[PDB]
Amino acid sequence: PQVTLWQRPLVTIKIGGQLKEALLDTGADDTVLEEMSLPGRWKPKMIGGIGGFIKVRQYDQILIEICGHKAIGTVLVGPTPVNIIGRNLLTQIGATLNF
Amino acid sequence: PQVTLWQRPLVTIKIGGQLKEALLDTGADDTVLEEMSLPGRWKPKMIGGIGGFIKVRQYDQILIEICGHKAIGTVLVGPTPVNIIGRNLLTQIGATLNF
Ligand SMILES: O=C(Nc1nccs1)c1cccc(CN2C(=O)N(CC3CC3)[C@H](Cc3ccccc3)[C@H](O)[C@@H](O)[C@H]2Cc2ccccc2)c1
């Protein structure tokens, strides 16, 4: 069900039993969520954007339920200001940009 | 056209005589471009991203041909690693995000 970009395209995730809103972010390669715990273990990666570089912890094989679509992928948790869903998951729910 | 996000949603833009390519980014609110000689007056501004903030020159009333369509808007020109088309413009072309 489609979304116009007049608002920030936020939807709700369920990750790891928790419910958060998240930004659908077609310009991000990866998904980076704020700090919260997630079962499993991780290694560091380092990501950047405008502003520079944060250090995040990466977990693979994480289920996320977006709306009521389930996806499995990497998530990176770290000090992002905003929870972001990026192309790696965006591709799994089949999200297109139409114009 | 439709973009699938399996690759970067990169698009061709002409701004102010100059051809560049830029990322269609639904996460971003405003459009921010690498340093470019656009005609003249600006306000000084800062934007927030991941990593920190950057400091940009806010030019308004910039006309851009985006893909092959056009819009007038504010662009922020400053030291971004990648050029971002953001929703302030994406709405003017009527880009929808879609699942
Ligand atoms: O308007 C903006 N800000 C304002 N502040 C005050 C008033 S308006 C704004 C404009 C352009 C970029 C950004 C920051 N931004 C980003 O840095 N990223 C890194 C990706 C890894 C997460 C991607 C773009 C990108 C991609 C590759 C390389 C560099 C940048 C992502 O796609 C993009 O949406 C956002 C993610 C984001 C959005 C909003 C808040 C925080 C973060 C913000």
From Swiss-Prot, chains A, B:
Effect of substituting residue 10 to V: Confers resistance to indinavir and lopinavir
Result of changing residue 89 to M: Confers resistance to atazanavir
Effect of residue 60 to E: Confers resistance to tripanavir
Stretches the record annotates as Dimerization of protease: 1-5, 49-55, 88-99
Effect on the protein upon substituting residue 63 to T: Confers resistance to lopinavir
Source organism superkingdom: Viruses
Outcome recorded upon mutating residue 37 to D: Confers resistance to indinavir and tipranavir
Outcome following mutation: residue 33 to F: Confers resistance to atazanavir nelfinavir and ritonavir
Record annotation: effect of changing residue 53 to L: Confers resistance to lopinavir and telinavir
Outcome of mutating residue 47 to V: Confers resistance to amprenavir, lopinavir, kynostatin, ritonavir and saquinavir
Recorded consequence of changing residue 20 to M: Confers resistance to indinavir, lopinavir and nelfinavir
Record annotation: effect of changing residue 63 to P: Confers resistance to atazanavir, indinavir, lopinavir, ritonavir and saquinavir
Reported effect, residue 50 to V: Confers resistance to amprenavir, lopinavir and ritonavir
Reported impact of residue 35 to D: Confers resistance to tipranavir
Mutagenesis / variant outcome for changing residue 66 to F: Confers resistance to indinavir, ritonavir and saquinavir
Effect of residue 54 to V: Confers resistance to indinavir, lopinavir, ritonavir and saquinavir
Resulting phenotype, residue 61 to H: Confers resistance to lopinavir
Consequence when changing residue 54 to M: Confers resistance to amprenavir and lopinavir
Record's function text: Aspartyl protease that mediates proteolytic cleavages of Gag and Gag-Pol polyproteins during or shortly after the release of the virion from the plasma membrane. Cleavages take place as an ordered, step-wise cascade to yield mature proteins. This process is called maturation. Displays maximal activity during the budding process just prior to particle release from the cell. Also cleaves Nef and Vif, probably concomitantly with viral structural proteins on maturation of virus particles. Hydrolyzes host EIF4GI and PABP1 in order to shut off the capped cellular mRNA translation.
Record's subunit section: Homodimer, whose active site consists of two apposed aspartic acid residues.
Name assigned to this protein: Protease
Organism: Human immunodeficiency virus type 1 group M subtype B (isolate HXB2) (HIV-1)
Gene field: gag-pol
Residues of the full protein shown: 489 to 587 of 1435
